[PDB]
Amino acid sequence: YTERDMLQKAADETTLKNVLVMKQAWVPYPAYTDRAAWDSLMGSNKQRLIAAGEKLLDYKWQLIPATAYLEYERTGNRKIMEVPYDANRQALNTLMLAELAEGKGRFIDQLLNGAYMSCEMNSWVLSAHLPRQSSKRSLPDFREQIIDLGSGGYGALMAWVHYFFRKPFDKINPVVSLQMRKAIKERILDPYMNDDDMWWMAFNWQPGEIINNWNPWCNSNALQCFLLMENNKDRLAKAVYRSMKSVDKFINFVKSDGACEEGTSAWGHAAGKLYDYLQILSDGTGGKISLLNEPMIRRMGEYMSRSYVGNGWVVNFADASAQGGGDPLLIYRFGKAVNSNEMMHFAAYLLNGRKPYATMGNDAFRSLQSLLCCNDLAKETPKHDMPDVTWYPETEFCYMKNKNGMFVAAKGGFNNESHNHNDVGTFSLYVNTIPVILDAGVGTTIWTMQSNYHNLPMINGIPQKYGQEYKATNTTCNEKKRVFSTDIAAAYPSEAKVKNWIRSYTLDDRKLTITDSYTLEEAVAPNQVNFMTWGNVTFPSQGKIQIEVKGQKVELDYPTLFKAELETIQLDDPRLSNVWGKEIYRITLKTNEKKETGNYKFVIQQIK
Amino acid sequence: TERDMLQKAADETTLKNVLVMKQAWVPYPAYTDRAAWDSLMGSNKQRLIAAGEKLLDYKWQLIPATAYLEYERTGNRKIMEVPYDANRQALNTLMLAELAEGKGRFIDQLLNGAYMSCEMNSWVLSAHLPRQSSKRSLPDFREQIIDLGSGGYGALMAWVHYFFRKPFDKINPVVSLQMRKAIKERILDPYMNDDDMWWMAFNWQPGEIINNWNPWCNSNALQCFLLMENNKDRLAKAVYRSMKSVDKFINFVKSDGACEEGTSAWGHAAGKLYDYLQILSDGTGGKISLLNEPMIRRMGEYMSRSYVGNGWVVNFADASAQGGGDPLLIYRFGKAVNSNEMMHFAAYLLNGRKPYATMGNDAFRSLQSLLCCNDLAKETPKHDMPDVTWYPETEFCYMKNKNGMFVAAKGGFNNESHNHNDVGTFSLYVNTIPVILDAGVGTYTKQTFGKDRYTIWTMQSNYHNLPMINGIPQKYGQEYKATNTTCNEKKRVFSTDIAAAYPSEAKVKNWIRSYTLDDRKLTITDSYTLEEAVAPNQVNFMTWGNVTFPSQGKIQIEVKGQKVELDYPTLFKAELETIQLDDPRLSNVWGKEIYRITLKTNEKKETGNYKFVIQQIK
Ligand SMILES: CC(=O)N[C@@H]1[C@@H](O[C@@H]2O[C@H](C(=O)O)[C@@H](O[C@@H]3O[C@H](CO)[C@@H](O)[C@H](O[C@@H]4O[C@H](C(=O)O)[C@@H](O)[C@H](O)[C@H]4O)[C@H]3NC(C)=O)[C@H](O)[C@H]2O)[C@H](O)[C@@H](CO)O[C@H]1O
Ligand SMILES: CC(=O)N[C@@H]1[C@@H](O[C@@H]2O[C@H](C(=O)O)[C@@H](O[C@@H]3O[C@H](CO)[C@@H](O)[C@H](O)[C@H]3NC(C)=O)[C@H](O)[C@H]2O)[C@H](O)[C@@H](CO)O[C@H]1O
Ligand SMILES: [Zn+2]
Ligand SMILES: [Zn+2]
């Protein structure tokens, strides 16, 4: 945590008040009643958005019974509530886009139905999240509103529906728009301003607590609601400034190198929602209050490009999946806003030759924003080019590649990272995008979290220990040599009796060389070294391992003092078997030798 | 008439001294008292449990804004009402089921229904919402009015609250909390704070209607207050307000007890007056009761006296000739006013069925039906009544003989509720079967209300059992009326002067129409003095079935195994006019066609008289 306070430095309340754009004149989308301009913006999305609306002409708005909320308390079941909720939210979002697309009034009755139904609900908070209310119960209490991820999203959608359709709604019956205004005030505007204690707001934040994606996510949703629904200038400025203060807490908490330590799947709702907030704030101040030119924000964006190896494979340290991806439309808009050419071409590359279409789902802002960027992204040329080395020195992540298709990811860190795995000093090797030395990733400390099942030694036969203090020391990257080095000794407990253990990775054009150099206090038990892999693993001769997997072939050359064995790991958990298939392997390297000082060299290269 | 029977029985001060607090008046066992529920339920137990089980996966139905908008767009009520009623019926059935079983199996669904009901902006029907300030068919979250629907919804919610508060609060006390709020917002407060709801009749003046809405809504509100309002000062004020409101209704109906609309509203008119009086009595420990008032007994006995048999009811005015009733209701009302006739009639109306709990959506009638089943089951079926019933102010006369003839006749005036131009008419039934009929109610058209009402054949005296005097029919209007109407009960003679129901053009001084029923025959007479003989009189009779003319002056009618001869003056030429029935509301009663017998003559004179005789033959 560092006090940058970038937003507060861009303005105080008074300054902000002077640049706030009133009466919703900041809105970038045309008027509902502009068949011509919507037609231009939409292009080929039009027919498709109309077709999606047509499928909802007879959609029955789903009631959420009290028992669905009670179920959270009874059994911890969340989906019984969330499925109908999210179905309603998506229906309302789609209908919005379809009516913007068609403009013939045909989807207005269903929009009005969804909006009216939504006001009758006692709350838009998820059943899993409602226990943060005073009562601590999972059922809505009409006496209190809080804000959560869901309720903020629902609020912003409702605000956008109000914004586009109030005029035709009012013609049918003005009480609908009236009650939407009350609902948004009671469930978003007022709680936001009157309750300092919501955990994601990060006011009263002490060391040891979390600030995560909830902060920029909920603040971006609150901000839209104010910008759309609050027409008093003093009230507006106070809320917007409040949001600036709250987001500063997140910006202060995340490391400047810009790595997202939760991975490429958290990216879209962490960095991605910081971006959204900042786009929203810029738009709302006529671009006068903008952090989109800040280099930390570009680095936070580019993590998504750097961390994406290819064909759906991504770097997956911690409790994260080796298969991931991202929203190419979001990535384009984020890249274009921070002037990352790399991000823009990377978005066109992820399209994998498909035409970009409107984002659906239930996030009104991204849906609407997707409409703006479409023609542009369709014009963008696809490439995934990036430097040979990326070095995140505070997060201690290092990516190194060569022109022959090897990509290595390595890390230092500490055994209390977000969604920790005990993995200080580990690496992952990809060849032509395919994992060859892998990181197992996330189940549904289980074994996937143990250093025993990462690409690491068991020093004196002992694994890494969990804990803040169990950490890398002296992590370095030589960007030009493609050398990563760290001392992992302090990640192990006392009984490991190790003074120093340097693990280093050197990638040249032909090979990856892995070294271990150690000094022990006492040689108690033989070291063991493990590697994780998959596919077709053979042992053609002593000191040699061959790995054949999705068209790739390498050899791992290892010291002849070790005995190599392949351990089969059946994957019954589907969240793992959906990535890797039915089984993966741990190669164990074991020995009878025990010395106080020594070293190992391992060499991985492709072969014919 | 300013009877003010309830205000005479107590004022607010008396009331306050006799109200029973803490719902100690409730006549049902505690939910936890399983032995007492089992004894009360009898064979209803397993029936109600099975009905409950059918609803364990019931999905509570949302009502979309467009369903309410549709009333305005097209007049469609059912789009809104069908899911609404389904919800209410499910909630009512689940209450009964859970009372029957007592194991907590239906609690979750009761909770769900209750919570869903709180989230609705309003419980008012779409057709009724346009009485709000905005005059729209969509709820307005800022404002509540009460209607037929919302009152019943409110009462049902109050009963759910009363029975299941404890197991609800075990789950999550916020549900009961929101229920109390909802009932307060939607029933208690509007009832107290708004003096201008049309059905309360606090602003009533001559010309305006008081109808069934009054006792029906008052009785629902009264329940809510007795269940939910624990401040005795607020309770007394509410109850006394309901007494003043319901007095408007009692003042308005005729003391002779005839429901002039006819039997089809009896269940929700006199029957809801009964419900209101029972609730009031229960809530005051019996201290404020009009259940002993002879007028209330006559109101309830009207349902007996007007029910001929086999689904056939007396149907003057715009009313179906087919009707019926809820035997359980009829029994309870009968018992309460000490009417053996009504209690035996209820048994008769069961048609040999065992009495089971009332289902539907009326929580009070469902619960009350549990209390009465065992005794109604024991009651002997009979439909006994005096040979003559004479309603002297409404001017309805029913006369019967031991050989199966039932004659209904009326005086009155051509501005009665749901009026037909029918002063002086009669209807004859033979072993319950209509033989000289009164066509009754058709499907509403634009012409049904307004001028042109009397261009609809069913409304005209031309198509009732009456003369066309100098070829002229009766005219609509308050002063088009009977005079010198008498009934000799001993001799079974009804007589009336119908001259003044006819316009000037009919140029008639007097026309006495009289009905004499003996042990075998009905004699109909006309005796007339015209001002001038313009045109020949015509006399009409309405009938159905198989109509034949074996000789001059004779007609035979055979219908549904009954057979009669009609003897008419040979001066008349008799023709049979076929009336093919396009309208299902008619054809569902009468079949494909009915007939008008026309009796016509070239005679024309200032005075004369006609005799007709109807007797059973073959
Ligand atoms: C119970 C509780 O309070 N747990 C907190 C924990 O909060 C949890 O954080 C999760 C997170 O990963 O951020 C939440 O997961 C996300 O919830 C969303 C709301 O239902 C859902 O929308 C996410 O998925 C995306 O939504 C998009 C849309 O808005 O259109 C889609 O288009 C998108 O592609 C879709 O995937 C969902 N993420 C998932 C499933 O990975 C969860 O609601 C929440 O409970 C806190 O982070 C931690 C912090 O220490 O404390 C716990 O106690
Ligand atoms: C639309 C409107 O306001 N109409 C007013 C009349 O009220 C109607 O009276 C009917 C009646 O009591 O027969 C009502 O019918 C009943 O409705 C309840 C609730 O849905 C239901 O339980 C019954 O089965 C049903 N009975 C029927 C159909 O016979 C109807 O809801 C109601 O709209 C009012 O009588 C007249 C009086 O002047 O005014 C109209 O404006
Ligand atoms: Zn891992
Ligand atoms: Zn009639």
Numbering used by the authors:
A (entry chain B): 26 to 469, 481 to 644
B (entry chain A): 27 to 644
Task: Give the original sentences from the paper that presented this experimental model.
Based on the Apo structures of BtPL33HA and BcPL33HA, combined with Consurf analysis, a total of 20 BtPL33HA mutants were made in order to understand the roles of individual amino acids in substrate binding and catalysis. This enabled the structural characterization of a catalytically compromised variant (Y291A) of BtPL33HA in complex with a HA tetrasaccharide. The complex contained two molecules of BtPL33HA in the asymmetric unit, with one molecule containing electron density for which a trisaccharide could be modeled, and the other for which a less well-ordered tetrasaccharide could be modeled. A hydrophobic platform composed of W224, W239, L174, and W242 underpins binding at the +2, +1, and −1 subsites, while no obvious interactions occur with the −2 sugar. The +1 subsite, the site of catalysis, is where the majority of interactions occur. The side chain of R103 interacts with the O2 and O3 of the +1 GlcA, while H154 only interacts with O2. N238 interacts with the carboxylate of the +1 GlcA through its amide group, while Y291 lies ~6 Å from C5. No activity could be quantified for the mutants N238A or Y291A. However, it should be noted that although both Y291 and H444 are positioned below the beta face of the +1 GlcA, they are too remote to directly abstract a proton from C5. Furthermore, N238 coordinates with the carboxyl group from above the alpha face, suggesting a role in charge stabilization rather than proton abstraction. This suggests significant conformational shifts are needed for Y291 and H444 to perform a direct role in catalysis.
